[PDB]
Amino acid sequence: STGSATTTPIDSLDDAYITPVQIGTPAQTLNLDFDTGSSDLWVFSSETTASEVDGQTIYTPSKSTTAKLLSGATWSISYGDGSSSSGDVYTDTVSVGGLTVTGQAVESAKKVSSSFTEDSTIDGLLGLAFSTLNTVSPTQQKTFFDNAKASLDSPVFTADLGYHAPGTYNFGFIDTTAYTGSITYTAVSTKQGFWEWTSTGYAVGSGTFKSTSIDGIADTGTTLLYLPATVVSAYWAQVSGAKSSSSVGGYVFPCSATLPSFTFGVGSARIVIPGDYIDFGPISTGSSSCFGGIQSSAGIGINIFGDVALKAAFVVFNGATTPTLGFASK
């Protein structure tokens, strides 16, 4: 089997991407944030505290003939940005882009934090990291990908995120028309439950490539690119007037600037992030101070190849017995 679904930015800054997902019978379609940095499929639901719902589409298990309460199971998750959600669990049929899993754990939110309530465009998350991170207790549950894997033509999914445009998540096949040149594969460590890999270095604009190992995670659920302070300082030093602002919470730059590209290494290959991808616009409406798309990972504890990086590439998440990550230009 295979699946193929279009993923669409939620706003003009590509802050996140939503992908339609069919849950239950008859289908209830919810727009979920596919997140390669977590491992819970959770949804706004008929059980979500009413004051914490503001425009989202909800999953109503009582209207699904295939929903079954997973008795005794609860979940609770906290994300890197400080947001959180929790609730109980149903199993139900879940389909993505024509690919169907029966018996998928669908985690129903009783509570969500303010950032979720305030984002009316995101109806939940679909985690695509390793199932060892799943938060369901007392019986840990498998991700949609883990459950689908045996049925898939090939045990892979791919992320092809757009810059200010729709893109695609494919399951079970590699679309050889979706990228240019060749795909370069690189080793993955699952030791922390993430798609964790080591970049071979970086360049700023037309500068020379610096060979240096940068361990980090491929995380479609994080907006920006978070790298070591040394790397980030080297980048922003090439932008006149750029500075780190503790009041704003990261590097800002004059909106009149032209940003240089940023290149990262994948083995001997190079992925180039155009300067425009690194512009996250005015810090507040009407401001001439703009927020940078490359920020320091210092104090996160991990480097994160978020959407800013991933959208510059066609990315293969290979879930074979020995997992790997592939990157191609596009």
Q: CB of 226 within 8 A of CB of 237?
A: no
Written as one string, the DSSP assignment of 193-206 is SS-EEEEEEEEETT
Q: Do residue 58 and residue 24 come from a single domain?
A: yes
Nearest CA among 78, 17, 87 for reference residue 59 = 87
Whether residue 283 contacts residue 289, with contact meaning beta carbons closer than 8 Å, is answered with: yes
Q: Which DSSP category does 209 fall into? A: P
232: enclosing H helix or E strand: helix 229-236
Q: Residue 287 and residue 289: Cα distance in Å, rounded? A: 5
Q: Is the Cβ–Cβ distance between 210 and 296 less than 8 Å?
A: no
Judge if 142 and 223 occupy the same domain.
no
Instruction: Please choose, from the candidates 216, 223, 245, 242, the residue with its C-alpha nearest in 3D space to the C-alpha of residue 293.
Output: 223
Same domain, 202 and 145: no
CATH number reported for the structural domain that contains residue 199 in this entry:
2.40.70.10
| End position of a domain, from candidates 174, 191, 212 | 174
Nearest in space to 141 (alpha carbons), one of 100, 91, 105, 108: 105
| Tokens (6 digits) for 234 | 């080297």
CA distance 98 to 113: 31
Output phi, psi for 271, to 5 deg.
-110, 125
For the purposes of burial, counting CB atoms within 10 Å of the CB of 309, is it exposed (0-12), middle (13-18) or buried (19 or more)? buried
Residues 191 and 166 in one domain: no
Distance CA 154, CA 179 (A): 18
**Could you say which of 39, 131, 199, 296 is catalytic?**
199
Residues 235 and 153 in one domain: no
CB atoms near residue 235 (< 10 Å): 26
* 131 noted as active-site residue: no
Q: Return d(Cα 1, Cα 264) in angstroms, integer.
A: 33
Claim to verify: residue 120 and residue 196 sit in the same structural domain = no
C-alpha closest to that of 58 among 124, 139, 149: 124
Residues 124 and 18: their CA atoms lie apart, in Å, by 9
Residue with the two structure tokens 């979706």 = 178
Q: Are residues 310 and 186 in the same domain?
A: yes
Q: 168 - beta bridge partners?
A: 6, 160
Residue tagged 């300067």 (tokens): 275
Q: Give me the resolution in angstroms, 1 decimal.
A: 1.4
Question: Cα separation of 93 and 109, whole Å?
Answer: 18
Tokens of 283: 């810090």
Cis peptide before 274 (omega within 30 of 0): no
Whole-angstrom distance, CA of residue 114 vs CA of residue 268: 43
Q: Are 168 and 191 part of one and the same domain?
A: no
| 15 labelled catalytic | no
| 203 and 170 share one domain | no
Of 33, 202, 60, residue with least CA distance to 120: 33
User: Domain of 253?
Assistant: 175-330
CA distance 45 to 155: 30
Long-range contact set of residues 275-280: C-beta below 8 Å, sequence gap at least 24:
275/205, 276/163, 277/163, 277/308, 277/311, 277/312, 278/225, 278/308, 280/13, 280/223, 280/224
One-letter amino acid identity for 137? Answer: S
How much is the CA Rg of the chain, to the nearest whole Å?
A: 20
The rounded distance, in Å, linking the Cα atoms of 193 and 113 is: 24
Domain stop point among 126, 145, 174: 174
Closest CA to 222 of 56, 25, 33: 33
Name, in order, each residue with C-beta under 8 angstroms of 40's C-beta and a sequence gap of 6 or more.
Answer: 75, 77, 107, 125, 127, 134, 135, 136
Of the candidates 169, 193, 172, the residue with the CA atom closest to the CA atom of residue 314:
169
Q: Is the dihedral of CA 122, 80, 305, 299 positive or negative?
A: positive
Q: For the chain, how far is it from start to end, CA to CA, in angstroms?
A: 25
Centre a 10 Å sphere on the Cβ of residue 191 and count the other Cβ atoms it contains: 9
Q: What are 126's two structure tokens?
A: 């679909």
CA angle (302 as vertex; 164, 18 as ends), nearest 5: 30
Instruction: Please indicate, yes or no, whether residues 316 and 218 belong to a single structural domain of this protein.
Output: yes
Do 153 and 184 lie in one domain? The reply is: no
Considering its fold, how many domains does the chain have in total? 2
Whether the Cβ atoms of residue 308 and residue 225 lie closer than 8 Å to each other: yes
CA–CA gap between residue 200 and residue 57 (Å, rounded): 42
Place of tokens 């017995």: 321
Question: Could you give the strand order of the β-sheet that contains 303-305, starting from the edge strand earlier in sequence?
Answer: 269-273, 262-266, 196-204, 210-218, 303-305, 225-227, 294-296
Cα angle value 146/148/154 (rounded, 5°):
95
DSSP state of 267: T
Annotated catalytic residue, options 35, 146, 219, 279? 35
Non-local CB neighbours of 196 within 8 Å, separated by 6+ positions: 188, 189, 190, 215, 216, 217
Measured CA to CA, the distance from residue 88 to residue 293 in angstroms comes to 36
Distance CA 201, CA 32 (A): 33
Q: Per the structure block, which two tokens stand in for 197?
A: 């890999």
Four-point Cα dihedral 39, 92, 124, 175, nearest 10: 70
Q: In terms of domains, do 91 and 229 share one?
A: no
CB count in 10 Å sphere of residue 42 = 28
CA nearest neighbour of 325 among 220, 225, 233: 220
* Burial environment of residue 184 by CB neighbours within 10 A (0 to 12, 13 to 18, 19 or more): buried
